[model samples]
Target: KIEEGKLVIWINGDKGYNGLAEVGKKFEKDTGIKVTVEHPDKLEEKFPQVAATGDGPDIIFWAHDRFGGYAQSGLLAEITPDKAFQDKLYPFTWDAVRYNGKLIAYPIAVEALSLIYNKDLLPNPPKTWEEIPALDKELKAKGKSALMFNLQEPYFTWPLIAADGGYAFKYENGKYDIKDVGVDNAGAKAGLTFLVDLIKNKHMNADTDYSIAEAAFNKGETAMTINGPWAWSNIDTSKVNYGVTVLPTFKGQPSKPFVGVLSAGINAASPNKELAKEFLENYLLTDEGLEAVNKDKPLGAVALKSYEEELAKDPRIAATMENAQKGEIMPNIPQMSAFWYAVRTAVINAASGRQTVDAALAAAQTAAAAAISPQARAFLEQVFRRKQSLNSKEKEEVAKKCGITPLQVRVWFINKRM
Candidate 1:
C-alpha cells in the first residue's frame, strides 16, 4: 500500500490540462504520489456512462452545473470544503458548487467572456460600443479582419441581453422564475439591433466560429476578439501583444457575460478517495499548486481568494476578473435548461436579419413555452395513451404523481391535444 502511488483525475478536453500535467509532475515529485491526468476526447459525453459502470477516476475536472446533475443522479460525493477553506474563495463560487442547498464540488476556476485586443491594432481598449466601428474600419482598411467572435455559439453573445435590458429568467430567493422570461422585451430588441447591424454591415462575418475567431486573432489577422480564457493557450504572446478587457458598454448599459465556474468532484464510487483528497486538497489547493495548474493559460480567475492577488497582476486575469465582477451566473435550475436554444435561435434570427428582432424574440418565447417541462412531459407520457379524455380522477392521479396541480395537468393535457 505504501508503494502503490497514483492519483488519477479525468479532466475536460481543454487548456488547464497542460497545467494539470505540470501539477501532476510536481505532485509526483513532492509527495511520491504519481498523478495521472486523462483527457478523453469524449469526456463530456462519456462521463455518465463511465460513472454508471461503477468505475471512474477519483477526481473529475468539469463545469459546476454538471455537478448538480451528478448529485441528483447520486453519482457525486457530498464533499463541501471546510468553512475556513471556503472563506478563501470568491463569494459567487459558493453558489456555483451548491445544488438544492448542498455543496458538492471543489470549484477551481471561474470564467466569463474577455474582450482581447491586439495592442498594436488598437493601442487602447475602447470603453464603449461607439468606438468599435471605427476600430473595425481601421482594421479593414489595413487589410485585416476586424472585431470577430463566435456567432454560432450563444454563450458569448449574452451581453446583448444586458445591452438590451432583457434577461433569460428573473431570479427570486435563489430560484429562477420560468414565467418571467425576458428575451422578448424592448431591451432585448435594442441590444439585438446593434448586434445585427454589426454583422449586417460586415464588421464581423455571420458564420465565424469560436476556433475561427481565435485563429484570426492569434494569427494577427484580426484586431480584436471576444473570447474566454480557454483560447489563451493558442495566442502567441511574443508575436501578438494582446490586451484583455471586459465587453465595452452599449448606450450607457454594461454588457454582462455568463459566469461559469470550473470545478472538480470526487466520484461517490471511487476506490481511492482519501488519496484523491490528498491530491486535491493537500497537494493541489495551495498557491503553488494553483499556479502550476493554471500556468501560462490561466483559465479566468480562480475560486480561491488567495489567488486573487496573484491573478490581478496579470492583465488577462485582471480583465477576466473585471467581467466576473460585473457578470451574471448561468442559472442551475432544470427550468433554466430551456433557455439556451431559445436564446440561440433568437440571436441567429436577429443577427442574420432572417427575422426582425421583435419577431425573432417572439419565436423564441413561443419555442420556450411549447417545449414542455421535463416533468410535465413525463406526466403526459403516463396519461396520453390511456384514453382520448382523462377523467377527473385520472387527471388528479397524473398530477399527484408528477407533483403538479390537477388544473395545470388538465390544461396541459388540453393543450397537448391541440
Candidate 2:
C-alpha cells in the first residue's frame, strides 16, 4: 500500500502556515519525502490528547508560546540543535523556544510591535513621548491624534507600562520570580498617569481597539499607530505611505515590546522524527527555502542572517529590526495565560475611567495573583467570576442577544469550555 519508497510526514496545517508553507513543499523537492498537511480546529487543544494516544502530526507549526505546555506534557521532540543552527537565529528567538535550557522548537519568524507612522502626516517621527503631546495642536488641526493605538488592549497598553520600568514578573535569579510581580509598581503608576493625560487631552479614547486604530491609520487620519508585522497587510498602499520604527522614548525610557516567535516543533511520538528534524534544520534553514517561505505572507523577518540580509533591502524589514532589538521575548510560560486576562481588565478599567489609576493598578495586581494561584480556584474564576458558564435561562438570554438559537448557545458554551 505504500507509494513506492516515499515517506509522508504530517503537519498541523495553519492558514497558509506562513513561514512553513512553501518551505514545506521545498522540503519534498530538496529531499524525497512527501508532507501531508492537515488543519485541525483548535489544534492546541486537539494535539495534546491526540499525541498522547500516539496519534498526531509528525510536526506542528504554531506560535512558540504554546510549546512550553507541550514540552512539559512530553508532546514534542527535544529540538536541541547545535551552535551552528543557534547562531543563525536572533538571540531572543532562542529564548522563546527554549524550556529548561533545551530547545523545544525551531523558530522561524520573530514578531514584536513597531511604530507605524504615516510619512505624509508628519515630516518626521517624534523624538520622544514628551514630543507627542506638544504635537497635539498640529495633529488636531489635521484631524488626527498625536498617537493612535488600542487604548483598551493590554498588548498595546503594556509598552506604556514598560516605558516606566514596570514588568509582569521580575527575573531575579536564573528563573522568573512569579512572586515578585511588578505590575502595580510605582513605575506602572507613572505610566498609567501619563495615559490619563492622553485621554483628558482628547488624543484618543478608551474604545480605540485594534480595528479602530488600524482603520484610522489606513485612512491617513492618524499620524502614528503601533502594531506588529501581523498587521502590515492592512496598510492601503495607495492611501498610506508609512514607515516602521521603535517606540519613541516614552518618558525617556524605551518602550519594550512583547515579542512572539512563530515556530515549528517535531512530535515526540512521531516515527518520522528524524525526517521532521532534517526538514526543519537542513533544508528549511537554506536561503532559497527561507525566501520562498516568506513570500506573500506577513512579511516577518527571518532568523537566518543571509535571508535577513536580503530582507533588509526592504525598508520595512530594516525598520522593524530596529524596533525588535528593543523587545523582550514574550514569556512562553503557561502562567502567562492568566496574565493576559487579568491585565486586560486593569487596562480596560484604567482606560474607561471606571477606576482611578491607583485603584485599577491595585485591582490588576490582585487579579494577577488570584489568576495563577493554582487548581480549581483558577478554573472557577473563569467559569463563575468571568460569567463564561451560565444556567438554562441565562443561556436563553444570551441566545437572544447574539441572534442565535438556544441550541447554538448551548453549543457555544460547550465548545468554549474546551
Candidate 3:
C-alpha cells in the first residue's frame, strides 16, 4: 500500500469535468488522498507536448484511443492487472485497454452509439437499415421527415460502415493494417451507396447538424436519430415519450457504433506513480469506487461485474450497458490520428454533392497514406534536392518567381521531407 496525501491529475475538459470531479471528491474522503483535478480545455493539444518533455501529471483520465499514441511514444507506464482487478472488470472493458498484449490503462466508463427515437412517433425502432427507407417514404407522404442524420459527421458514418461489415483499419499480426481501406470493399461501397441514396431520396436532410437532430427528436419534428447517451442530460424526456435502443443492423449484424472508454493512466514520468496507482486500484476498481462513479455520471460503469450487480438494476443504466455490449471499441493506433480527419473529409465531400462516394474515399485514403507513409518523406527530399542544385541567385530568383512567402517556402520544404 502507498500513502497518499496530495496528488495532481489532469482530465479532459468535456465530460471529464463533471464525471471525474465527483469521483475525485469521494476518493479524497475515503483514502485521505487529496486529488487536485485539473481540467484542460483541449487536453489533446497539451498531453502530447507534456508527455514529450517527460513532465506530465501523475494520473490522466482520458479516452482509451489516446493510449496508443502515448504508449507508442514511450510516455505511458505498463499496468499489470492482478487477478483481483481482472475478475472485477467486464471482459470487454479490459480488452479495450489491452494493445499487443500490454495493458497501459484502466477502464472507468463506457459510452456507445444508440438509436434515440420519439416513442410517440416510433413505438418500435426500425429493426433493419433496409426498413429505414420505407419508413421515411411513409413519413414523407404524411409531410414529415422520418429521420435526421448528418451526412458530414464521421461519428454517424463510422457506425454505418461497421453495420455493413466495413472498417477503416483492422488489427492483424499485432499491427494496424490499412490494406482493407477503401470504399471499393463491397460492404463499404454498399454502406456509402445507401447514405448517398438517402441523401438523394430526401429520406434524411443533409443540412441537419447534430444539435438540430437532437432538438428535432425532442420536439417531435423527426421520428428518430442516432446518437449516444451523452445527450441524455440535455434531452427533455418529460416533454415527449422517448426511447433508446441499439441501432438497426445489416445482414443480421448489429450496427457497431464506436465504443469509447474513459480510463485512468499513470504517467510514466510522474514522481508519484505508485501512489497514483494505489489510489486508482482501491478507489476505482472496488465496489465503493463504482458507486462513486455511477453517482457522478449515470451513463455506465467501468467494472462490469460490480456494475451488473449494483448499477444494472436501473432501467436506463441497463439499456445503456446493453447498447455498449453490441458495439466495437474504436481502434487506438497512432495512424488512426490521420484516419479520422481523412474519413470525415471524405464523408463530408460526398454528402455535400462535391464528390462521389468512391472519389471521396479514394482521395481520403491517398491523403492518409501520404500523411503517415515514408514515401511522403522521399518525395519531399527529391523536391529539396532539386531546389538545392540551383545556384544561390538562381534559387532566390526561383523562390521569388513562385511568389511564396519565406515562411511558407521553409515549411513547404521541411514538411515535404518529413
Off by over 4 Å in 2: 1-19, 28-58, 82-84, 90-92, 236-239, 267-272, 370-418
lDDT of 1 by residue, 179-289 (tens): 777786888778778888888888878788877887788888988889888777677554788878878888877788878788888877776677777677766777887
> How does each model score on TM-score?
0.80, 0.76, 0.78
Residue 176, candidate 3: alpha-carbon lDDT: 70
For residues 210-258, write the lDDT of model 2, one tens digit per residue: 7788888888888899887757766855458888876877778888776
All candidates' lDDT scores? Answer: 0.74, 0.70, 0.68
Worst 10 residues of 3 by lDDT: 397-406
> Which is the leading candidate under lDDT?
1
By TM-score, the candidates rank as 1, 3, 2
- Candidate 1 clashing pairs? 88-305, 164-187
Which scores greater on TM-score, model 1 or model 2? 1
